[model samples]
Target: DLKSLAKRIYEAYLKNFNMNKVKARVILSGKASNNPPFVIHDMETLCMAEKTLVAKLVANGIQNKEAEVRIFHCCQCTSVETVTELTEFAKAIPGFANLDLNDQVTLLKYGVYEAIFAMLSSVMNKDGMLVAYGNGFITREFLKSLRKPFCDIMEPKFDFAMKFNALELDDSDISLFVAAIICCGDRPGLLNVGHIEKMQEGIVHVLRLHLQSNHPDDIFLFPKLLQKMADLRQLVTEHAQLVQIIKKTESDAALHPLLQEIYRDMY
Candidate 1:
């Protein structure tokens, strides 16, 4: 019964936010002219090269005021796109639309960043994340170089991404995982906890079955993944604090309206 339901959600994930299909050229550190973007189809080589290339940039001093602002702007743009995709994904979930309108908004408000951070592993590695649809790569070091409070934001995500990426989940696996995160019953203000919990149970059952068949040797993978969800909750808490700091310190940097709404009452 849940198998068919899981299949529908997986199809929606592919339709709405599939990153495996995107072919992104590798953008290395330093000036684009000097680095010369190239595509690496092999994941192993890409991961290794991402580390070395960013190290080179750090050694050459890529950190500066302009770069920080550019990275911040890029992240803001990515957030806008992520929120839109997340909403569409949530809508595609079988029972999400049936929830009270306020519950739907509350779930999205709390779960959007967690979902975005979870899906980021698809385009991320230890050194950096592929942004602008894989055309641009921003180094973790460069992000860390941003002015105070702003620089504090990305390291936790990098830490989370590195661990999550190790699981090597395909989009189908992630589709159900994200749906489970959004439809979570524990979110602070749910109008229908029972309904949402039932939905989460079905999603998790499908996820467990999917992982068992997909990675039969790794008995602990499902639990490890659930642990990552716990980690995401803490990560979002830290993120909200940093966002509040950024809000006060860098009043000049404009957050997208959607993001603003999500954070407005986070404190």
Candidate 2:
């Protein structure tokens, strides 16, 4: 039922997601439950919808939030929380409950659908870059593939949440949501945690800078994913060429045009 619909959306997104930079978007939650604008309507309905939706999305490989109903549940309003303690989400994503209330509030106002889509689209650009490098960089691949927090992994739960309220979300809020997801992408894994954190900080800057421009410019940087593959292969080719240059050239050597461009660009 709902699973089929969300699955279709997921698949469609992957096909359309063939790009370099992620495209930003803002859609009315249309139909979701249990969180923010969704809870802003009817907590009980949202609770039920969110669980069902997450079960499906999880089964399909999207790591979405899974929620449980709490006795503390009350009438819908803006104060609705994304992670309700005593619910399984607290156990699933440990520190998520401790995220700054103000930050959580900003995310909630954007609606989960918009946040996730922006994440997926932005990841496409990132993944496109990694796909060029091959699967050896799984963490990097994952960073660019989804909205996951590295070292802090969540299950693939695509449950339902509340329908968005026009009153709660604005375009700016959606941009924040998109930026938040992008920032998370740069946080890779255990060994290079510091690098990824710094990367995330830089990404936050990029996300904010791009937020004001064409929304889709994020993915526009990705272009054809083949571009990444081509770029990476060129590096491999340069290494081989450099070896040959070393053998053939006498005295002090310098880069061939191809190697020269790569060195200059990277340096």
Candidate 3:
């Protein structure tokens, strides 16, 4: 029964949130562009130069001036896309739709950034992340070079991604992980915590079984994966604190409206 349910979850993942499709499309488009799929040195040099400009602006007490603003916009745009996909994927999770309307919203509101952070490992490596549907890559060093609050947000994510990718999870494992994050009953303001927890247990059970069958040699993988969820919670807390700093210090730079609401009272 749970095995069948796990299969449904896996199938739903492939249907609604397949990274392979995204990668395939990116590869096809790269070929069409005909000038090389990625230009690493050019981007690295540009980011290096921008870091110099950012240093000058900060020295002049003009933090979030130009380069920081660009970084904020880039991150916000990617967040908007990730949240949209996360919403769709949550809807397809079994039992998710049956929760109270407000409970569903609350779960997604709190869990979305964590889910986004988890899935981000799929498109990332120790060096950098694929951006613009793999057309561009933003280096870890460049992200670390940003100004305070802005710079603070990226390094932790990169650290987490580098470690999480070491687990070598495929889309099937990631799909269940994202679902478990969204269905968590620990989110405040949930109207049906018991029901949600029951749902979460089912998902986690299925995840454990899937991992057991798939990685029989890695006996500790299940607990290690569970540990990542705790790590994500801390990351989200730090991100919320940084967002507050950005709101106060970088008032001129706008967060996407959706992001504004998500971070409004997150802290």
Candidate 4:
């Protein structure tokens, strides 16, 4: 039964994904694309902006953390857009729409962050992550220069991104993994646990099969990916608390509407 369900989900997963729109990638016809070390940016413009932000950071102390912010701004903007996409993707799942409305919202609340990061990994390069789909590259050095707790919160995600990129999972593999994250059963407050648990298991089965075929020699890959899901949960949990603290302590720093809304109900 699981074999049949996993196969069907895998088939359906393949049909719904558009690789280009998934993370921001430049793909070949039939292969996972190698990521570029630096995302394309207008060197002159970026240089000028960086100088301004740097001057403010050096002179203004923690006061300019907001003014010096661009990477997190772009990330929040992206997160806003990502949440919208994830909502629709959840509805597109075979039986998700039939679930209780509260359950749907609950799933999105608990699951979207993991999906967001999973999708975010594709844009990660050796130097750092690409923001705004490659127009604004947030290098590791820039993030390190942020205010104390902010850097503490942001760096862990970058760490996860780099390792995830090392896994080199293609679009198809990532889409299924993202699906598995979204349909999880263990999300606190889920009412329809039976169906959700079954869905999660089937998607995980799909992931296992996909990873096996995709990384034939790497027996460790599947479990490693599973471990990553746990890592993501922990990271996002901390990130949520970080957002709450930022919202409480930093009035100067503005949050994206969607992020604010998420934090509003969440914390």
Candidate 5:
């Protein structure tokens, strides 16, 4: 049963696409997110693991020139195995590479190995705390996300934001960092309260510095860290019981999907 479900989802691409003449592979980190039940990363590189793995399987028997790489976000796992939140798939799981592709695909498709995703998803979806709104840690990925090609408001302030991210004391850079966070959050109206509160402290420090010098009124409220903080307060107030619930929901979501997918095969 698990094998069939895994095959249905896994080979759905093969049936839909003309894969008779192409090569493909999956790439990702080895660790699953601790918070989310089954979120694993691409093992080898910074790429998505499931995408890379599937690609490799599809590419296995195909000729080099005609091989095609089809990428999918199978598991939102990352490279950070230990410190990062562990996904349910990571719990008591064996080394994936040690298994054959046939077996690997089976495990993923049916959610067999750990069998904890259904519970995880239910928990995570309730509070919607999958991620906090204003987390803008400055690193290659963060900087890259801001300056990505064809972005709407991609022009990021490299000097100050970089400093704030790296060492935490660049009031000038705080402006752009705040802007980038808002853009990513998409639903600025629904950020986590804790995130909003923390952001408030950070914004105030930079705001005073800007006012003392010469604040730009134009971009003032758009990326207004203070205003967003206000939004956070309202969010926390409105969703009084939502805070702890969200945290718990997210923590379990990361680890459960893997199991749910698998347990279905039992019945």
Candidate 6:
């Protein structure tokens, strides 16, 4: 059954790694001294959110204790690495190469955040999120303490993650979901609209049926999951807007080349 096949696709996505430069150090030896240091950039005056976050860190004793915070290296490449991995995952789809290269890039760029958020549910609990490319767990309160823009950006994601997590989706579910996200035909400049749409429709079909089998009593789950796609689109749009604002003000912050290219080409 294609529904069962969804599990296979999801498994492929889960097993597929190493395409990104920033790898998640899933477990640590409990020594921050042994880990790479996360570079903190000094930007403009602290926003209200930033002040709140610093206070939370201080309240948690995280401000004074540097050893508790796990560090990630190559912060500049974080976004680039994420996009790279997403690209690889997109290419792994059964018929992705059938689309034109430009079309592929377009879909991949537009769909990256959707796919990212879908997978993010794996690590999110009720109160915190684990950074995918590093060994850091950010509490909801701590995240809210970030500056206005950054805090605003991720809180909705966590909220969505919490709601989405309630569905208890498996990797197979996410695999098909993310593929459908990447193959969205309505994106601008798509060279193979019909083919991509057909592919997406089929993936959505399989996902719907999979949910039916997985949650027989819950009739609303399929449409609810579909609604999340729309939600993800809105979130990504907001995220891009904030990214541009941050880019303008935080010139000292490292911006990856590919991310800049994506903004230029897509926005």
Q: How many steric overlaps are in each model, in order?
A: 0, 23, 0, 0, 58, 4
Q: Which stretches of candidate 3 lie over 4 Å from their true place?
A: 18-65
Task: Go through the candidates in order and give each one's C-alpha lDDT.
Answer: 0.75, 0.29, 0.77, 0.68, 0.27, 0.65
Predict model 4's lDDT versus the native. 0.68
Model 3 steric clash pairs: none
Candidate 1 stretches greater than 4 Å from native? 21-65
Residue-wise lDDT of candidate 5 within 130-205, one digit each (tens)? 1111111112232233211211111122221222223221223332222222222222233243443443344344
Candidate with the larger TM-score of 2 and 6: 6
Better of 3 and 5 by TM-score: 3
Candidate order by decreasing lDDT? 3, 1, 4, 6, 2, 5
**Model 4, position 21: C-alpha lDDT score:** 33
Compose the digit string of candidate 4's lDDT tens values, residues 109-131.
Answer: 88889888777667665555655
Report residue 191 deviation for candidate 6 (angstroms). 1.4
TM-score for predicted model 6 compared with the true structure: 0.75
The predicted structure with the larger lDDT, 2 or 5, is 2
Residue 219 lDDT in model 4?
Answer: 74
Please give, for residues 1-267, the per-residue lDDT of candidate 3 as tens digits. 987887777777787653543463354344445433353334445454344534554465543346667667667888998888778888889999999999988888999999888877776667667665655556677777776767787788889988997887777787888888899988877787999999999999999999998888888999998999999998998888888778788877777899888877665
Using TM-score as the measure, name the better of candidate 4 and candidate 6.
4
lDDT of 2 by residue, 1-267 (tens): 323322333333334322212212111212223232222123344344435533554465332232211211110110122112112221222233344443333323222323333332232222121111111111222222332221111111111111122112333333333333322322212233444345345434443343334345344432332242233234434434443444354222333443233233221
Model 5 clash tally?
A: 58
Q: Top model by TM-score, which number?
A: 3
Candidate 2: residue 244 Cα off by (Å): 59
lDDT (10s digit) by residue, model 1, range 31-66: 345444434333334344444545554455434324
lDDT of 4 at 153: 57
Model 3: lDDT to the true structure:
0.77
RMSD of 1: 7.4
